[PDB]
Amino acid sequence: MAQDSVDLSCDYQFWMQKLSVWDQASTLETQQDTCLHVAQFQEFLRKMYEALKEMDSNTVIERFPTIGQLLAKACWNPFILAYDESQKILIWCLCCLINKEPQNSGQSKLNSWIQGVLSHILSALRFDKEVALFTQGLGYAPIDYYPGLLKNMVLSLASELRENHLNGFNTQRRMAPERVASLSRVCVPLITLTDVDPLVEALLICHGREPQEILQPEFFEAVNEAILLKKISLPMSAVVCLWLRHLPSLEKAMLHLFEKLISSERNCLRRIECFIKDSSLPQAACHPAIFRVVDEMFRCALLETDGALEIIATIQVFTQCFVEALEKASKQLRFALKTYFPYTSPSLAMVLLQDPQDIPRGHWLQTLKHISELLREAVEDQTHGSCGGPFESWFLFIHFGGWAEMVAEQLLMSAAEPPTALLWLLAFYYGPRDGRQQRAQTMVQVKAVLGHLLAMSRSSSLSAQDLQTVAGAPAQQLIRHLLLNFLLWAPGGHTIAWDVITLMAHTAEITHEIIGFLDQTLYRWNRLGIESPRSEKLARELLKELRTQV
Amino acid sequence: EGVEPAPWAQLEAPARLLLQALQAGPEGARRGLGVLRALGSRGWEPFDWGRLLEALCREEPVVQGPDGRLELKPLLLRLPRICQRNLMSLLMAVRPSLPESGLLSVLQIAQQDLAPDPDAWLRALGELLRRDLGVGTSMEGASPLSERCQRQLQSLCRGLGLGGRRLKSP
Amino acid sequence: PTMLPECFFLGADHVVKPLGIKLSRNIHLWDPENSVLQNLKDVLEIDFPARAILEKSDFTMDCGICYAYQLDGTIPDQVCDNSQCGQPFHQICLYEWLRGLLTSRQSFNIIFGECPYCSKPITLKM
Amino acid sequence: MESLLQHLDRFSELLAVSSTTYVSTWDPATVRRALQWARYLRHIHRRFGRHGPIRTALERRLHNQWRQEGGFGRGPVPGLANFQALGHCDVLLSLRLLENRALGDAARYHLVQQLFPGPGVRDADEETLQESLARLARRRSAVHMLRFNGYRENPNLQEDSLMKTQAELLLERLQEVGKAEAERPARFLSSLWERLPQNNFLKVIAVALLQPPLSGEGSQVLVHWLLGNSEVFAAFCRALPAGLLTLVTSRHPALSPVYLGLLTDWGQRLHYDLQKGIWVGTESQDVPWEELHNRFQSLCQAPPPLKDKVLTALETCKAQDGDFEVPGLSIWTDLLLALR
Ligand SMILES: [Zn+2]
Numbered sequence A: 001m002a003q004d005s006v007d008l009s010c011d012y013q014f015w016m017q018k019l020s021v022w023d024q025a026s027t028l029e030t031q032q033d034t035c036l037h038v039a040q041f042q043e044f045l046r047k048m049y050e051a052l053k054e055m056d057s058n059t060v061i062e063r064f065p066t067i068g069q070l071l072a073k074a075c076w077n078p079f080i081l082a083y084d085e086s087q088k089i090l091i092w093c094l095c096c097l098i099n100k101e102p103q104n105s106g107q108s109k110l111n112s113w114i115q116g117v118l119s120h121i122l123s124a125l126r127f128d129k130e131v132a133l134f135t136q137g138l139g140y141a142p143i144d145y146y147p148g149l150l151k152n153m154v155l156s157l158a159s160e161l162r163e164n165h166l167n168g169f170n171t172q173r174r175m176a177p178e179r180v181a182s183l184s185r186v187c188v189p190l191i192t193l194t195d196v197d198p199l200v201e202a203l204l205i206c207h208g209r210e211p212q213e214i215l216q217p218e219f220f221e222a223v224n225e226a227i228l229l230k231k232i233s234l235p236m237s238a239v240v241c242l243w244l245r246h247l248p249s250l251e252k253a254m255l256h257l258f259e260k261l262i263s264s265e266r267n268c269l270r271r272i273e274c275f276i277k278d279s280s281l282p283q284a285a286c287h288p289a290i291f292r293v294v295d296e297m298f299r300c301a302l303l304e305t306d307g308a309l310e311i312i313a314t315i316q317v318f319t320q321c322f323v324e325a326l327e328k329a330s331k332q333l334r335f336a337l338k339t340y341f342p343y344t345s346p347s348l349a350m351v352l353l354q355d356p357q358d359i360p361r362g363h364w365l366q367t368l369k370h371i372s373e374l375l376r377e378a379v380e381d382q383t384h385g386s387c388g389g390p391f392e393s394w395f396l397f398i399h400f401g402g403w404a405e406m407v408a409e410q411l412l413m414s415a416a417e418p419p420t421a422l423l424w425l426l427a428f429y430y431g432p433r434d435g436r437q438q439r440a441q442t443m444v445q446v447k448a449v450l451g452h453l454l455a456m457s458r459s460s461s462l463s464a465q466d467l468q469t470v471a472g473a474p475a476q477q478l479i480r481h482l483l484l485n486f487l488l489w490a491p492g493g494h495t496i497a498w499d500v501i502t503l504m505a506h507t508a509e510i511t512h513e514i515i516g517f518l519d520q521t522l523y524r525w526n527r528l529g530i531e532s533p534r535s536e537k538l539a540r541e542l543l544k545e546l547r548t549q550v
Numbered sequence B: 001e002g003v004e005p006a007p008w009a010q011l012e013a014p015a016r017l018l019l020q021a022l023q024a025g026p027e028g029a030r031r032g033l034g035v036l037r038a039l040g041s042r043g044w045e046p047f048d049w050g051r052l053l054e055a056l057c058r059e060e061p062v063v064q065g066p067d068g069r070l071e072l073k074p075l076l077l078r079l080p081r082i083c084q085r086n087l088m089s090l091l092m093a094v095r096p097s098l099p100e101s102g103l104l105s106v107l108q109i110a111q112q113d114l115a116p117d118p119d120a121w122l123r124a125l126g127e128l129l130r131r132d133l134g135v136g137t138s139m140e141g142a143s144p145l146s147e148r149c150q151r152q153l154q155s156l157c158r159g160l161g162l163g164g165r166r167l168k169s170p
Numbered sequence C: 001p002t003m004l005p006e007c008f009f010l011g012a013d014h015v016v017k018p019l020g021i022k023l024s025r026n027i028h029l030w031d032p033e034n035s036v037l038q039n040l041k042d043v044l045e046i047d048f049p050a051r052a053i054l055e056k057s058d059f060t061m062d063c064g065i066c067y068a069y070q071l072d073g074t075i076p077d078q079v080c081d082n083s084q085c086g087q088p089f090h091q092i093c094l095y096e097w098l099r100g101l102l103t104s105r106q107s108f109n110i111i112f113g114e115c116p117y118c119s120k121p122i123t124l125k126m
Numbered sequence D: 001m002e003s004l005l006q007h008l009d010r011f012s013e014l015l016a017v018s019s020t021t022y023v024s025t026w027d028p029a030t031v032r033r034a035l036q037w038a039r040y041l042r043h044i045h046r047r048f049g050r051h052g053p054i055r056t057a058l059e060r061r062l063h064n065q066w067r068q069e070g071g072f073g074r075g076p077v078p079g080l081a082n083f084q085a086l087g088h089c090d091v092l093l094s095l096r097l098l099e100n101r102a103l104g105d106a107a108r109y110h111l112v113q114q115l116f117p118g119p120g121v122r123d124a125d126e127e128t129l130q131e132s133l134a135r136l137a138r139r140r141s142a143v144h145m146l147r148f149n150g151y152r153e154n155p156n157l158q159e160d161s162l163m164k165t166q167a168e169l170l171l172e173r174l175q176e177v178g179k180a181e182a183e184r185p186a187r188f189l190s191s192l193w194e195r196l197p198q199n200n201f202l203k204v205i206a207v208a209l210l211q212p213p214l215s216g217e218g219s220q221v222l223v224h225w226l227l228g229n230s231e232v233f234a235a236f237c238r239a240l241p242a243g244l245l246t247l248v249t250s251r252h253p254a255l256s257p258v259y260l261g262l263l264t265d266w267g268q269r270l271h272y273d274l275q276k277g278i279w280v281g282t283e284s285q286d287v288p289w290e291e292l293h294n295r296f297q298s299l300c301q302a303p304p305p306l307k308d309k310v311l312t313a314l315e316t317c318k319a320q321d322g323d324f325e326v327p328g329l330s331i332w333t334d335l336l337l338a339l340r
């Protein structure tokens, strides 16, 4: 109710004298500029169409003056018509313009001019004449063969490019890289049109022997868009080579993953596994270099937010998908794991790989015992010929969920003299760069808290205040999520749950943290086939109600 | 007239074959491993990497940009992109069994120091390899990623309540 | 060197699993003080073939291009006419090899060109 | 069953007269009527158009009507071609009336209103008018874009997609006449030949012969027409390249023996001059020495079954003209020496 023309009326002249730039784009540079400026102009058209549809035509003159020239430019510009709904919005626009009963002959002229451009778009051979007259004589219409026609056109070229790829230093026709670059710009406007997929596949695969790129990355990223938006449905080898030759696509897609775990679907891990397996990210990650990239990205993410739980959850989902994609399709000659994990020794990794589901529930204690032993041998006796230091082995340890989370729940099950192994381990988890002075401090802290909570579980379902009393920091999140483990695990819970929860419910940040923790633990149980349905339904109801509070 | 030989066409058979293997798409990576398996099996177990690196580094001319401008390139950049990347990936893994002297100059190339329109991949890869050598921290903003990437990463790392984990030791 | 290595197996799925779980369960029993064999025999809970057939270990039947068996159902049937190579190869892999090779020449349907491994005349009939 | 017949014939009447520029009487009622008829008919296309006696009966009505009107005289109307053409029946007429400028005021406005009320009815299960037409113009622009911005004219014409497209159009167009047996395919081929550009026609047929079948009876009917018709064969062998005709012949050995005589006629009606070491044409439009040499060199580069036809047709044509062994005397020896 404020501007009513000007945010639109300025961009009117902008796009207007930009059509004068492009004008059917029979060049390279008109084409390139048009390609980047298409969709913005499309939204401009949406606003314009709204502004027209709401009102009548043939009475107002707001920007009606140059409109015919504007639309004629757009129409004769075919890349306009190649983008998704641009054409259709042009239709609706022109429909807004028509007059039922032209009264002054200018209205009739307008309408006839409209019909003319319409037929120009719809019933016009913009094409060879021989094949036109051939079918005219055969008694056909454009329609009834344009699809298969198009298809044949595509297929010829698709084969051709395979030939060119196979010709790895032959004497034969080295196909024009100019035509290739022409196609690179021709595909993208109509990338969504279904008859094109094999061409694009072939463009991305038939790499050839240039030392320098010959496609424009506008194409690479306009492709990346429709991949990650799932409008294209390509094979896997195509998108891997795309990721593997154009880096900003990879970067921008890994970003698009974070967009979900932060923006929309905080702590619904099944959406996250769904997204990972929807894309071929673990499959692509089977390739080493891509794995190292995404590792570096998550490492930066991890050192900005010093221990973001949602991010760590995402890591472990991705690691699982990657491990299975690796075990699937790498029978002969798979990469030695210190490829993907060089800084660490391989021995520790070799242990970490083992699934919990392989082993009975009892020996997981012994597993974690040897693990924490080895982490101590690593980081405490931090000698050269190993990891650089603590952070690196800690980051290694992140990726293997279950082996990370089982310490608390096992320690709840082994508070009968909880062994120093698990204490040091979880201390190392919740704290890197601590020093043994800090680790021994937190050790006895949590062990005294265990002396409390053991007897507290042996007692009846006591209050939430005997719990909040032992709270009063360097050990707040540790002790917090430890208590959360204790709650569901101990059957004394399920009564004082909301009490403890509303007590610790200071903020929404801690709320989201714990929500992620809970979705994590439920996800873990369902995957492991390890459940107490009490705690399942309990945590379910709680997480559900807290998804209303946020 | 509009034909060229292979730029590798003049070389030791094993290594030339290896290049012709790495040429072959993504999978060429693992084919690299298969080659070395086959050759440690074959009568010539000693594969002189030292020999190979020299030929990678060695310069030769090209006439690119306009029609009227010479420049030099080593083998390593004139050969096709996919072989470069596959090769780099293999090198990461065989890094134990390589000589530093040649590796370093290779990495000086890998930097593509003052290469307008550079190879982002190769740059990141050289960075990472130098890091794996324990010498590529560089005391720089030594991110294989772009500062663009790190920027829009921090832009959303801001939108999460950090943990109290002491990761930096300020 | 006495440490645990990075290790795994190749072969048949059903034979693979049980030893996998033996390892999964005896891994904490690693002792980098005796022989690694001493560690292995009692972690995987087995004794091993000391050259069960020293002669016919594996005359490998992989592609040699893609190092694979069963390429779209195809066997690497195409071989070298050479005593020193004898290497099997896949039809399509060896095709796309010798096609890109500059030295190759096409007949009506049959093509000739150098064996990848030994560089001797090899013939492929589609 | 018969309800479909009177539904269809009235529809096709209305279809053909859509384009006709008598349009003054029309109103949106007629518009809606035609449109809902077309909607019912594409509904029928969906419903039980698939394999059945009704499918075949309606296809018989189609070809019956199309050979009744002929495609000549009173109208060479394209019309809805067949079963699959029915699938977009409304669309074709919508296109007809746009170009029919007898299209008036009110029915036109109501028409465009029907077509494009906006995305106000964006939620619909059937891929409707707007979606279809959008994809249409999408594909059309795509077609021209490729034609001008990456398309190349293949030297191997059979490989070329346009000729390949037209080839399968025509094979579609003749399998139907072979199934129908209303008139012979020869009556159709003749009328075609005369009416349309014969230069393009020959090339189209050249590519047509070589498409592997899909259901090769059309390939047979062609050679049965064309070994009968030589005046086409005269310009045929004249207009085309060498290897095209070579592989055509290896495909249809019936064309081998005739084709040797074609050249052999041209081969004998030339004269050496010792001003210039060449045979040369008496007439302007006679095949040059090298013009023919190319063809025979292609035939040398042919399969062995077709190789020895010409190889001995040459020796026989030589010896009957005197079995000389030196230039200036025998065109055929000039050849046979040039071929080595
Ligand atoms: Zn193979």
Ligand SMILES: [Zn+2]
Pocket: C080, C081, C082, C085, C086, C087, C115, C116, C117, C118, C119, C120
């Ligand atoms: Zn060999």
